[PDB]
Amino acid sequence: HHHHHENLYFQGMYPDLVHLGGADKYFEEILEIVNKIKLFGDFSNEEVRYLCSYMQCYAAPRDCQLLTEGDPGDYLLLILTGEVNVIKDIPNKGIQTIAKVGAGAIIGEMSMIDGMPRSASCVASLPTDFAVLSRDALYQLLANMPKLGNKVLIRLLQLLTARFRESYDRILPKTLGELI
Amino acid sequence: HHHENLYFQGMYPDLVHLGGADKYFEEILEIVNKIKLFGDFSNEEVRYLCSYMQCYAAPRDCQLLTEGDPGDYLLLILTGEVNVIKDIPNKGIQTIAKVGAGAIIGEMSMIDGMPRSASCVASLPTDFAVLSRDALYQLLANMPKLGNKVLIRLLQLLTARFRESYDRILPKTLGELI
Ligand SMILES: Nc1ncnc2c1ncn2[C@@H]1O[C@@H]2COP(=O)(O)O[C@H]2[C@H]1O
């Protein structure tokens, strides 16, 4: 049902997307993504099959704008295949690529988590398949299976800390003058 | 019981133990209930969480966190002001952020086990609560639904930090970023 209306949104908003059906078709890829979790213990096969039931998948073509800076968004994307350019309209610099990600990446977590507009645009540079997790689906997972929920949240925490460390190791040395 | 990593810090003898976070319940409540979308912490929940934390007073110029150190704990800043300082390859040592009352710092190493990404130095005398990774593990094991709320709070801390840092730092960059 959630997925029914989620699908209407994607097909309505995202004309180029082809619906692939349930994320169980990408169990092995999703298992690998989530089991990058460290320090807190892995997801079981059974836990991953359950998580897969919360998600539907889509194929995007080359040059598909998966996410657009400044748009509202309540969903994140697990990149199963392909390549995505993360770009931002940076004051005093114009539109620039801040990151390039591929198979295994998670994108769109920020607005899904905090309800602010998208921080950057994400464009499929190659044909790209992905699973979608909405905030509503996450709500339901935390309500129903909170321990699994905390594995998911720890995975997203580690995604963000790694991204923050990598990004600012790359970006700070390119800065000019005083930062504060 | 004081958290091991903190106890054995070089600056530890400069700290004054203020007691349990229960003594700072209102301050803790104000920090954790910045949570959005997913539901607020009840007062009972915040009381329970307080049992997992000790509070300390640090003097001015205290190096609360040191870049490169092991870091299995985070700090909730109750009062004071803190400079986030980093050794930037090519640029040198710079203040990259300033935070104050209500801020959370040290979340990155606590979450991922890498060495501290920056130093955090009290520019005014600063009081803080300490949450260890061990305490978090117990909380998740003992009380997963309350755990969910702590984790969402930390997620939102990081997303906000990403966004606010982007808005401030990216416009100061020169050339290609990747
Ligand atoms: N430095 C980065 N590295 C990788 N991905 C990023 C980076 N910054 C932003 N993103 C992604 O871009 C997405 C745009 O939408 P969100 O802000 O919801 O979530 C953002 C992140 O998933």
Ligand SMILES: Nc1ncnc2c1ncn2[C@@H]1O[C@@H]2COP(=O)(O)O[C@H]2[C@H]1O
């Ligand atoms: N841009 C920033 N703004 C606020 N705090 C930061 C920033 N960069 C790093 N920090 C904090 O500095 C801390 C150093 O220890 P951690 O790496 O564990 O966690 C880090 C963050 O809590």
